[PDB]
Amino acid sequence: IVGEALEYVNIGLSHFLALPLAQRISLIIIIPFIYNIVWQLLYSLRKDRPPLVFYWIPWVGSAVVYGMKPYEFFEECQKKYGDIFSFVLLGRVMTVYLGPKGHEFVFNAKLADVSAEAAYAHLTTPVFGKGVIYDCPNSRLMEQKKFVKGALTKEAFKSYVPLIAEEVYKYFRDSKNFRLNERTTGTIDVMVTQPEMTIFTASRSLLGKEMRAKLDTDFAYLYSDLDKGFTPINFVFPNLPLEHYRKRDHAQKAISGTYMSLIKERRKNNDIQDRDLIDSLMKNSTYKDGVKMTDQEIANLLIGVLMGGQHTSAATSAWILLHLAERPDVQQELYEEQMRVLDGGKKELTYDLLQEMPLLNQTIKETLRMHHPLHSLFRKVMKDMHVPNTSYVIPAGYHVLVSPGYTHLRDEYFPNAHQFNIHRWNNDSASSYSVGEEVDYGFGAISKGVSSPYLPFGGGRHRCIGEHFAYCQLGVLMSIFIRTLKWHYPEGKTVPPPDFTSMVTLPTGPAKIIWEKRNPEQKIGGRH
Ligand code: HEM
Ligand SMILES: O[C@@](Cn1cnnn1)(c1ccc(F)cc1F)C(F)(F)c1ccc(-c2ccc(OC(F)(F)F)cc2)cn1
């Protein structure tokens, strides 16, 4: 008789349901925690799965450790388990593939194996709007990137350079952080100054003078609100009945409206030229199946590209200034190059002259190596993936995580990886370099191999299309900083650690530098 025993199963369940509320609430915690521990131990005998990082708290997983310092988490995991390992993150299973073969396994994954929009849609769509980037099929994204890249040409960069330089000189003249006509030395926070310079220069060149002029009004409040909405909290809390979210949503509606007003006002007056990205998106924003982007999708794609280039470029800027601020030898070297290429300052900065400043371009290159703005890129795995040369299978529903920024800081690929050395790039000062065969996913010919250990702009179909614009912008910025100012740290200060819980790996604030004018009596002309 085990019928007697199955009777006691029923009896035992009734006694459980009659336990005090003190013991049942403690059991609604103990039973998940123990089953979590038993499951992991049985999962560790699966030979068709990467090793899984142990963790106590269910659902949360390695969240805290990974979120606070992810490169140190990866290196500990890499020493324990090798280059392929999985870890649980706020409900998901993330399979990291570290190193250049992980660049290949993720960035070059078949379109049917992995989805970037499935990983990112809740991150970006609430900020940018609907129908663009990750709120549309991949084929739509590929052509959207063709549209934007069609405004990012050599000829456009030759007109952006004097526009960007004008904004920098105006910032030095008019901003309270400088006032170079009035002050010859001062202290700035680079996390204050660089996001401002970045949007001022990005607005003026990409969006035009009307949109730039709007940031001198109360309208700048809306960019701030929108900017605050650009956060990784959206991964788990995209829309909450909270106040930050309404200012964010209001700002998205208000900013896309301004852009549409200009779009419809320029099409009504047929004022459609070749000035800015707006004119280009107006002239060239029809998919190859003949559907035209709407005015609203055009404005949402403007917010996406402006927001993305905003955070990457302003963090990089801030990092270039923070590193140079303890390197007066590099400032000095960079300044000699300015004097040589620009005839002691008697030549006007041009896009062409920027391409003859290899040390300045190497400084950007070296900063992006040490401070890759994106420490982790995700795809959601759609179909079961076999990891080559292993017995590993990554089942559907997993995420794959690739981290070229980790590889940038490994000694085995960059000698003395943790030293800032622009001369590691002597005779290799180009933003990036397709080391062979190319391929086109819809937005131009890019590198087919993505095995490079330096991948600041990723690779494959989801590869950045902003790299030439960002060099142009940073190039002009830094060329004017160098020529105008020396700068250094307050006493006993140094490079800050990155913020990895943020949207980009920007420096922990406040990060102050002291500036002094090279020519205290030089004045900046124009009215204010
Ligand atoms: C220092 C500056 C920048 C860096 C290091 C950078 C880095 C990256 C990386 C790593 C990716 C790949 C993301 C992924 O694989 O999930 C990417 C994609 C992209 N970036 Fe950038 N970015 C920068 C600035 C910009 C700028 C200035 C623009 C446009 C003006 C831009 C537009 C884009 C676009 C459209 C994509 C495509 C994403 C996709 O296809 O899913 N970025 N960028
Ligand atoms: O790729 C971006 C940024 N980007 C690139 N180029 N310019 N901007 C982008 C792409 C196309 C655009 F049109 C605009 C745009 F902005 C992005 F999609 F948003 C993006 C994707 C992922 C993350 C990320 C942040 C934190 C993370 O870490 C932890 F721990 F999870 F929080 C992990 C991942 C940040 N940004």
Author numbering: 7 to 534
Source paper text:
The fungal cytochrome P450 lanosterol 14α-demethylase (CYP51) is required for the biosynthesis of fungal-specific ergosterol and is the target of azole antifungal drugs. The azoles target the cytochrome P450 enzyme lanosterol 14α-demethylase (CYP51), a key enzyme in the ergosterol biosynthetic pathway. The tetrazole antifungals are a new generation of azoles designed to overcome the toxicity and drug interactions present in imidazole and triazoles. The CYP51 LBP comprises a heme at the base of the active site, a substrate entry channel and a putative product exit channel.
In this study, we report the X-ray crystal structure of VT-1129 (quilseconazole) in complex with S. cerevisiae CYP51 (ScCYP51) as a surrogate to understand the molecular basis of CpCYP51 susceptibility to tetrazoles. As we are currently unable to obtain diffracting crystals of CpCYP51-6×His, we have used instead ScCYP51-6×His as a surrogate to investigate the binding of azole drugs. The structure includes the full protein sequence from isoleucine 7 (I7) to the first histidine of the C-terminal hexa-histidine tag, most of the N-terminal membrane-associated helix, the transmembrane domain and the catalytic domain, including the fungus-specific loop. Strong electron density within the active site allowed modelling of VT-1129. The ligand occupied the sixth axial (distal) coordination site with the heme iron via either the N-3 or N-4 atom of the tetrazole ring, at a distance of 2.1 Å. There are 20 residues within 4 Å of VT-1129. Unexpectedly, the water mediating the hydrogen bond network previously seen between the heme ring C propionate carboxyl (RCC), the Y140 residue and the tertiary hydroxyl group in VT-1161 or the triazoles FLC or VCZ was not observed in the complex with VT-1129, although there is some evidence of density at the position of the water. In the absence of water, the Y140 hydroxyl forms a short hydrogen bond only with the heme RCC. The tail of VT-1129 lies in the substrate entry channel. However, our studies with full-length ScCYP51 show that neither VT-1161 nor VT-1129 are likely to form hydrogen bonds with the homologous residue H381.
